[PDB]
Design a protein around this ligand. Structure first.
Ligand SMILES: Nc1ccn([C@@H]2O[C@H](COP(=O)(O)O)[C@@H](O)[C@H]2O)c(=O)n1
Length: 216
């Protein structure tokens, strides 16, 4: 029974890696970003309301998992899993995630999900705020250019055309906003281990994290 915190900037690979690791350790992967994006989706639907307390009050949000253990986001009884990226949500999520009522709502749900351990949770404030007692806290990093290029490649693959410069600029802007916001900004926990993903296979990084897991 262990919990693994995986924090890092945008397009750092986190979700990918978190899936593999969870798989190999027969654990469940929780993508917290999906939660903030779902709430941002609701925000857009509500004409970008500034009343986040009310938004959260009048919203139900559950994370569920399929056969392949893939995470599904159920917002107000609708599966919005496939509408949280490569669209306007990405451009507004940092702003919405900076709001107190939003973070309080999401964090409480995230802790409930990890109460019985067995969770590999990725995000920005997992090792610092959500799972301060996680058995392993990893802080994934890579250069903006590295991350931009990897996102670009992925996109071209997935059948999504994207402009490299825009991708890099948006990634930089999101990371900057997330690192400077007043509440639970993205930052390395004192007991976290830095892990550079640059020039490393999706497998290599998974192996490294597993290596650390075996030590505890
Ligand atoms: N644990 C988390 C996960 C995501 N977030 C917010 O959600 C956004 C989307 O994160 P992902 O790109 O990881 O999907 C981040 O840029 C950040 O603003 C957060 O503030 N804390």
């Amino acid at each position: 029974a262990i919990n693994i915190a995986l924090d890092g900037p945008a397009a750092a690979g986190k979700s990918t890696i978190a899936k593999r690791v969870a798989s190999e350790l027969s654990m469940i992967y929780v993508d917290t970003g999906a939660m903030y994006r779902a709430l941002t989706y609701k925000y857009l639907k509500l004409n970008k309301t500034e009343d986040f307390a009310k938004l959260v009050d009048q919203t139900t949000l559950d994370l569920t998992y399929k056969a392949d253990k893939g995470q599904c986001v159920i917002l107000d009884n609708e599966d919005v899993t496939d509408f949280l990226r490569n669209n306007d949500v990405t451009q507004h999520v940092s702003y919405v995630a900076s709001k107190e009522p939003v973070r309080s709502f999401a964090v409480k749900k995230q802790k409930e999900l990890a109460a019985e351990k067995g969770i590999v949770m990725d995000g920005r404030d997992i090792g610092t705020v959500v799972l301060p007692d996680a058995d392993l806290k990893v802080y994934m990093i890579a250069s903006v250019e590295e991350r931009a290029e990897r996102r670009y490649k992925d996109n071209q693959l997935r059948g999504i055309e994207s402009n490299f410069e825009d991708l890099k600029r948006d990634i930089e802007a999101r990371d900057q906003y997330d690192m400077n916001r007043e509440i639970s900004p993205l930052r390395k926990a004192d007991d976290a281990v830095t892990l550079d993903t640059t020039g490393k296979s999706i497998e290599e990084v998974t192996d490294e994290i597993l290596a650390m897991v075996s030590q505890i």
